Structure formats: structure tokens, C-alpha cells
Automatic annotation (TrEMBL):
Protein name as catalogued: DotI
Keywords: Membrane, Transmembrane, Transmembrane helix
Domain of life per record: Bacteria
Protein species of origin: Legionella pneumophila
Length: 135
């Protein structure tokens, strides 16, 4: 598990979460579940639920897409609760658009990636915590 291996793996992860539309959101959602640890997935869902973004896309029939504003960094790394973790951070530009609309947001995604058995996640690592903020 390289630091760069985790960084990129964390790069796809973030962008994937903001790549879906009102037509396929269920496939896209469920697809990116491998990216997450057992609880990181529960956390990610709970966060989705609380946000409306999804209801917005479904309602206004939008196509979400995102791109990395800057390169992802590792704020801190090392053992957290007997599991080696990386706290990766990266800004993105989300683009909620349709035939009628076109919005953009500047977001900062922060993920806690930890090590996990390859018997459940062939990669070896997983997002234990996915957290979005503005600017």
C-alpha cells in the first residue's frame, strides 16, 4: 500500500461519489460501495440521506459530475485504533446540470482511509469516513 496508491485510490473514490444522474443513481451508488469499509459505508449512506443533493437530482432530473480542483494530500497518517490510516483531502468542482439548469459547487472532500482484510476488499484499504464541506 503506497502513499501514492492510497492517494489515487482516494481520488477515484471521491469523483465516483459525484458521478451519477437521475436515471442511474442507484447503480452508481451501489457500485462505489467497495470503496468503503463496513462502517464507512454506513457513514456514507447516512450522510447521503441527510443531504438533499440526491432528491434534487431526482426532482430536477440532473446529471452530476465532478473534477479534482487540486491534487489530493495526506493531512496525517499512521495507526488509529490498531489500524493504519490515511486522512486524505482533495477539493472538487461538482457540476449539477440539466437541459434547463447548470449549478456548480466548490467542495472539499475529506476521507479517512484505513487498512482492511483483502478477504472482503481485494484492494486492502477502505474509506472509513467520507466527509464533504464547502470552499
Amino acid at each position: 500500500q503506497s502513499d501514492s496508491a492510497v492517494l489515487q485510490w482516494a481520488n477515484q473514490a471521491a469523483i465516483a461519489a459525484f458521478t451519477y444522474n437521475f436515471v442511474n443513481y442507484r447503480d452508481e451508488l451501489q457500485a462505489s460501495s467497495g470503496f468503503f469499509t463496513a462502517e464507512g459505508w454506513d457513514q456514507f449512506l447516512g450522510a447521503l440521506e441527510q443531504s438533499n443533493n440526491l432528491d434534487a437530482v431526482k426532482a430536477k432530473k440532473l446529471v452530476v459530475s465532478a473534477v479534482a480542483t487540486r491534487a489530493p494530500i495526506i493531512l496525517q497518517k499512521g495507526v488509529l485504533n490498531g489500524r493504519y490510516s490515511w486522512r486524505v483531502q482533495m477539493p472538487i468542482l461538482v457540476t449539477y446540470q440539466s437541459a434547463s439548469e447548470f449549478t456548480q459547487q466548490n467542495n472539499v472532500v475529506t476521507m479517512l482511509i484505513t487498512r482492511v482484510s483483502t478477504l472482503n476488499s481485494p484492494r486492502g484499504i477502505g474509506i472509513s469516513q467520507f466527509v464533504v464541506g464547502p470552499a
